[PDB]
């Protein structure tokens, strides 16, 4: 299939794409923006955030999004802006939220990270109507929380360790039986960024420094690799009428001026048709 650059956005750190309301929502973390792309018309919308904004999730029974800001978990509405829901960590850590997913029970799983990308201060959190629980700890850069279609397996990535872990996910939301799922040896400077799981239970992982994304079987073997004209690919997101259009956010962060001249579409939004559909986006049950 041919890859299309559908938005030559040149984002600094495009991240956190979701498919919602039949359109693509995502963020630019470092430019502090929420973006919205309508594939049917090409319309583009952008919203300024008061701090770094790192993930978006729709809410059950309500309008707007729950979003991760460096200053805490907020509610966002285009008309009214940002309102604090919960501060999850002590500001002195210089942490920020990063990636997130919503499981089929309406739980929001999100990670935090050292914004300086040096300390092992990040954690994994599970947020729902029973509160916020810390589920894993001591990770420098968390990434790519996601769950299988049957709801029994949970994946989480420690990016700088180049490792995706798998867990048993119980019906009551507890994790057990952590094990290595995939350890990356695709290059000295290739790291796993964000991941999603498709309708067959295969994991799609975007590669920082790896110019694309890899699809893994539930047993952890790579079965296909997509190439993009962008060194840093941050996250996949299934969209389109059949959830068979795979979108990718990318990042210019970390690339020299010479590399950006060579790969000027770095930071753009890319799209490619794939054969197996993704999973439908779930909504957070906040109350
Ligand atoms: Fe990420």
Swiss-Prot record:
Catalytic activity: D-xylono-1,5-lactone + H2O = D-xylonate + H(+)
GO biological process: L-ascorbic acid biosynthetic process
Record-listed E.C. numbers: 3.1.1.110
SUPFAM superfamilies on file: Calcium-dependent phosphotriesterase (SSF63829)
Cofactor(s) demanded: Fe(2+)
GO MF annotations, alphabetized: calcium ion binding; gluconolactonase activity
Co-factor: note: Binds 1 Fe(2+) per subunit.
Residues the entry annotates as binding Fe(2+): 15, 143, 193
Organism domain of life: Bacteria
Key words of the record: Hydrolase, Iron, Metal-binding
Pfam families: SGL
Binding residues for D-xylono-1,5-lactone: 96, 98, 117, 143
Positions of the catalytic residues: 193 (proton donor/acceptor)
Enzyme class: hydrolase
Disulfide cross-links: none
Function: Involved in the degradation of D-xylose. Catalyzes the hydrolysis of D-xylonolactone to D-xylonate.
Record-stated family: Belongs to the SMP-30/CGR1 family.
Official protein name in the record: D-xylonolactone lactonase
Species of provenance: Caulobacter vibrioides (strain ATCC 19089 / CIP 103742 / CB 15)
Gene encoding the protein: xylC
């Amino acid at each position: 299939a041919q890859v299309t650059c559908v938005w030559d956005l040149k984002a600094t750190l495009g991240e956190g794409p979701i498919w919602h309301g039949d359109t693509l929502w995502f963020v630019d973390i470092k430019q502090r923006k929420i973006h919205n792309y309508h594939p049917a018309t090409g319309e583009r919308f952008s919203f300024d955030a008061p701090d770094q904004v790192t993930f978006l999730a729709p809410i059950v029974g309500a309008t707007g999004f729950v979003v991760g800001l460096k200053t805490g978990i907020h509610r966002f509405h285009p008309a009214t802006g940002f309102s604090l829901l919960l501060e999850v960590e002590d500001a002195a850590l210089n942490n920020r939220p990063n990636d997130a997913t919503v499981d089929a029970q309406g739980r929001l799983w999100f990670g935090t990270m050292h914004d300086g990308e040096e300390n092992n201060s990040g954690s994994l959190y599970r947020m729902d109507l029973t509160g916020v629980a810390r589920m894993d700890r001591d990770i420098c850069i968390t990434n790519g929380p996601c769950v299988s279609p049957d709801g029994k397996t949970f994946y989480h990535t420690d990016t700088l360790e180049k490792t995706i872990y798998a867990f048993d996910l119980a019906e009551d939301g507890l994790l057990s039986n952590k094990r290595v799922f995939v350890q990356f040896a695709l290059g000295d400077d290739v790291y796993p960024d964000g991941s999603v799981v498709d309708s067959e239970g295969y994991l799609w992982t975007a590669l920082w420094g790896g110019f694309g994304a890899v699809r893994f079987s539930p047993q952890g073997d790579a079965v296909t690799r997509i190439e993009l004209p962008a060194p840093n690919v941050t996250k996949p997101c299934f969209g389109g009428p059949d959830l068979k259009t795979l979108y990718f956010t990318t990042a210019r962060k970390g690339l020299s001026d010479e590399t950006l001249a060579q790969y000027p579409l770095a930071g753009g939004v890319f799209a490619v048709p794939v054969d197996v559909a993704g999973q439908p986006q779930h909504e957070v049950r906040l109350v």
